[PDB]
């Protein structure tokens, strides 16, 4: 759920925080943690290539299993649900009967002690991962591969899910969280369920400093820059920019998907805008 | 609703004699069971207002029976409260 | 093209009449409407206008060789019987008359009452 | 333990000789759960009054079980996940 802060200070008025109710353990698996460091939005040239990044809390990477392909038939039990800094969803530590320990995105409703299984023979129960071929149409799924063996790429953020609409030949038709309908190979893997932590979107961060903790630097509006800095810059007093809205690099607001991408053959229709 | 089995068990414990089903002690004990079970139901079904009205009627009845017991024999009243775990 | 036996779909509403002749597979071979026979406005809802529309579609169907027709009528208009009669008189055989006005099992809210 | 009558409509593309074994395994859920599986009447291929999942016909089975509510709901869920099952229908067969 969401816990609302009391208005004891201007910075806290209106703000809220996760109740972290699903969290069972406060520390990660040592053997599944890798180091991570901040990039500040700078690339190999040391140039800022993504603005508004830097200054966030230090965090470590939990190795998430996005393939789940080498454990068909080996059941696992959910040992813990824990917080991950690197994504909106929570993560579930699985103990396989192999004695292997792996992290997976925690689906909605998955509790400690549940049994999870993988592969063609698995039951259609939240957290079970199996080829789309064996997933009946109409089911809600997440963490879907784009290419067989490529690893889960779609529907990974907290609360999101994909609906498997149907199967025809080698392809399954999927409705994306965005609403776009697209085809994927039926050999591609998916996990049954929605993604957990769906309440996170309702959090009111409350104050500038908390976004700084999350690594977001301030965004200066174009209209308050000078012409040399931004096409919207300039003018005496307040202005609307003095021209059609453009990026800081002058690109107009239009479609930016490249024409004639090969994936255009797999896309049935694009998302609808302003429905 | 209470089954014949659950009713027999409750009456065997709180009836003042065998075959007793009508004494306030027996009735309050039956009411207390019903109420507990209905409270369990209303924890799951928050919006079942019609069944919760039934609950309030059972509560009112129990109160009146308890008021009768206290009017007749305070000793039986205190025994009944403590034996059932009621507050008042 | 040629087809010996077909179906006639007649949709008669309070404003118009639309007859279409079709193969049993549902592909339309000919059609006519009260506006296609030159009636405009309210005149195109009269039974006489349904007569002419049914006749015109029947003639166009004879061209493609239709001999016998089963008629499916819907709608609440006044050019249903007239249309059946005009199909027969224009030289088509009418086997079955079946009425298939779409009826909801309590579905979408009707538009509000006129006053 | 309450009596329940389960109607199942199976794929007509199946063979009837293999229908009976496949239902029996599906019904083990009840026997492991402590309930009974009395009668598994298998009607033959009949014409459906309307097409279901593009099928004009299907195989009707009637299964009478005494079991706990939880176990019969588990059975139905598995049945509806099976590809060969088209439509199920569970009816409690006792007063109220």
């Amino acid at each position: 759920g969401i816990r609302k802060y009391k208005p004891t200070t201007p910075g806290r008025r209106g703000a809220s925080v996760s109740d972290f109710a699903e969290i069972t353990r406060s520390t990660p698996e040592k053997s599944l943690v890798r180091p991570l460091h901040g990039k500040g939005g700078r690339n190999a040239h040391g140039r800022i290539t993504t603005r508004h990044k830097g200054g966030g809390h230090k965090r470590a990477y939990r190795v998430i299993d996005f393939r789940r392909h080498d454990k068909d038939g080996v059941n696992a039990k959910v040992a813990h649900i824990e917080y991950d800094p690197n994504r909106t969803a929570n993560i579930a530590l699985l103990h396989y009967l192999d004695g292997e320990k792996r992290y997976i995105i925690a689906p909605q409703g998955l509790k400690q002690g549940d049994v999870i299984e993988s592969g063609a023979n698995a039951d259609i129960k939240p957290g079970n991962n199996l080829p789309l071929r064996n997933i009946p149409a109409g089911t809600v799924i997440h963490a879907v591969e784009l290419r067989p063996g490529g690893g889960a790429k779609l529907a990974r953020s907290a609360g999101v899910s994909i609906q498997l609409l149907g199967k025809e030949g080698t392809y399954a038709a999927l409705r994306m969280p965005s609403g776009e309908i697209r085809r994927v190979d039926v050999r591609c893997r998916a996990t049954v369920g929605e993604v957990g932590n769906a309440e996170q979107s309702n959090i009111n961060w409350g104050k500038a400093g908390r976004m700084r903790w999350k690594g977001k630097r301030p965004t200066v509006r174009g209209v308050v820059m000078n012409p040399v800095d931004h096409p919207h810059g300039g003018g005496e007093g307040k202005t609307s920019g003095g021209r059609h809205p453009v990026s800081p690099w002058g690109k107009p607001e239009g479609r930016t998907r490249k024409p004639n991408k090969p994936s255009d053959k797999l896309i049935v229709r694009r998302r609808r805008t302003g429905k | 609703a209470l089954t014949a089995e659950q009713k027999k068990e409750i009456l065997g414990q709180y009836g003042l004699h065998d075959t007793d089903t009508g004494s306030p002690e027996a009735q309050v004990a039956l009411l207390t069971k019903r109420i507990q079970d209905l409270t369990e139901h209303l924890k799951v079904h928050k919006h079942d207002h019609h069944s919760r009205r039934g609950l309030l009627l059972l509560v009112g009845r129990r109160r009146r029976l308890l008021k009768y017991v206290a009017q007749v024999d305070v000793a039986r009243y205190r025994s009944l409260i403590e034996r059932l775990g009621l507050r008042r | 093209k040629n087809v010996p036996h077909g179906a006639a779909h007649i949709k008669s509403t309070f404003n118009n009449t639309i007859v279409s002749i079709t193969d049993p597979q549902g592909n339309v071979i000919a059609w006519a409407s009260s506006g296609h026979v030159g009636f405009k406005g309210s005149r195109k809802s009269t039974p006489f206008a349904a007569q002419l529309a049914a006749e015109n579609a029947a003639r166009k169907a004879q061209e493609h060789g239709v001999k016998k027709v089963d008629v499916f009528v819907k709608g609440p208009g006044s050019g249903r019987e007239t249309a059946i009669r005009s199909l027969q008189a224009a030289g088509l055989e009418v086997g079955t008359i079946s009425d298939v006005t779409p009826q909801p099992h309590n579905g979408c809210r009707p538009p509000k009452r006129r006053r | 333990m309450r009596p329940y009558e389960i109607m199942v409509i199976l794929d007509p593309t199946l063979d009837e000789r293999t229908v009976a074994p496949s239902l029996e395994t599906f019904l083990n859920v009840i026997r492991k759960d402590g309930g009974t599986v009395d009668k598994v009447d298998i009607w033959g291929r009949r014409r459906l009054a309307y097409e279901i999942a593009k099928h004009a016909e299907g195989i009707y089975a009637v299964i009478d079980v005494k079991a706990e509510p939880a176990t019969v709901s588990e059975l139905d869920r598995q049945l509806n996940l099976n590809e060969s099952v088209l439509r199920t229908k569970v009816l409690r067969t006792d007063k109220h």
Binding site: - | - | Q103, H105 | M7, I9, L48, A49, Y50, G58, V62
Partner: protein, 65 residues
Amino acid sequence: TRKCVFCSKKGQTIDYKDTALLRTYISERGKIRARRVTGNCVQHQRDIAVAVKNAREVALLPFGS
């Protein structure tokens, strides 16, 4: 007016299985016949109506033939 055949001592049980029994109480349009026409009592008419609806869902009877 006419009596309710299910109140008689011979009255057949009403089950959604029995397509041939239920056929008595639906029109050729497939519609459930009014009790005022059939003579059924209130209780048995309810049974018939429910049995017919269950029969339609298990595709033993049509939705409006």
